[PDB]
Amino acid sequence: TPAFDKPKVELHVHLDGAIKPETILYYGKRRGIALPADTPEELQNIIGMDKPLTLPDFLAKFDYYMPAIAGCRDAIKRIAYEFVEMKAKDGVVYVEVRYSPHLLANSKVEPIPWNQAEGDLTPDEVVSLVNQGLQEGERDFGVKVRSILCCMRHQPSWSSEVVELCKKYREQTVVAIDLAGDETIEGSSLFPGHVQAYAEAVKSGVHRTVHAGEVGSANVVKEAVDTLKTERLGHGYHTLEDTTLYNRLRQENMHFEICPWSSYLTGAWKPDTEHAVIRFKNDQVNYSLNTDDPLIFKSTLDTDYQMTKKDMGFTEEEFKRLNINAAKSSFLPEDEKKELLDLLYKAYR
Ligand SMILES: NC(N)=Nc1nc(-c2ccc(CNc3nc4ccccc4[nH]3)s2)cs1
Ligand SMILES: [Zn+2]
Secondary structure, three states: OOOOOOOEEEOOEEHHHOOOHHHHHHHHHHOOOOOOOOOOOOHHHHOOOOOOOOHHHHHHHHHHHHHHHOOOHHHHHHHHHHHHHHHHHOOEEEEEEEEOHHHHOOOOOOOOOOOOOOOOOOHHHHHHHHHHHHHHHHHHHOOEEEEEEEEEOOOOOOHHHHHHHHHHOEOOOEEEEEEEOOOOOOOHHHOHHHHHHHHHHHHOOOEEEEEEOOOOOHHHHHHHHHHOOOOEEEEOHHHHHOHHHHHHHHHHOOEEEEOHHHHHHOOOOOOOOOOHHHHHHHOOOOEEEOOEOHHHHOOOHHHHHHHHHOOOOOOHHHHHHHHHHHHHOOOOOHHHHHHHHHHHHHHHO
16 A cells, blocks of 8 residues: 555655644644644644645745744654654654754744744754654664754854754764755855855765755756765756756766655646656666655655656666665765665565
């Protein structure tokens, strides 16, 4: 019934769109914040979409619930532990999971998100708290888990507190820096706070990932590669608009973090046309399959493989190939990965 019953790797999914309805009220309703609702069953259908909204429709979704968990310590650790638990029900042996500390914070961060007031919920406490619930999740649900912390494009002021959090919490449990948010902002990749954060990353050996080529042209993908020095791309569908960049990522073994079901609802991929991942799969690309914002997309990893089985023709050696290139591209330290790759060869034949 589920498209591909075997174990899985996932590398692109955001904490703060992978929170449950239910604990959206429990913190919501405890905290009064208060929502479009009071059933734990109909947040879901409002802050979950069915069809391609726009950018502002989309960010406004964050506005109802985010203010219910950010700010409250209890809920930062809650959503950590509960996240691990979804991945095991999805049949995932390794997940890298991501988020911005700033967006959980309530103290120590200009500007203050989600309209909230002051506080003592620090950015650094947020990372502390997330690590926790992540770890109790590896031990309870038996998924191995690392995190990535996420620069916001519009906010290059944060970025250096970012790379530094990434060296503070190194291995316990953060493996990488990300860049995200809205790739529309002209020359965002190239803001000095973004560039120096990634340079520092290189200096002190944090890994690197970048969201690019999703709603954004190929030149944003070339700046992620050549200036920011990433080792993998968040999405990168626009790489195909630029063939020489292509042939070279293809020659370089770049890994692309695909969200196919995300690519519909966001507008990244058009209904009429070519699917980026079919092409990437006719060309034997280094890519992976990924959920992204499962709240907001009303979905599970099975949504994604279903789609790919049930339209774009995926055999199941695809499925296996792609989960192999995924733990190959992972940001596990070198023993750890060989160990993961083991698990998966055992399971796959
Ligand atoms: N959990 C996540 N994704 N964090 C954050 N993401 C933003 C993002 C802004 C623009 C993004 C990419 N562009 C984008 N445009 C969209 C239209 C419809 C649905 C989704 C969309 N995402 S993600 C703000 S905070
Ligand atoms: Zn993303």
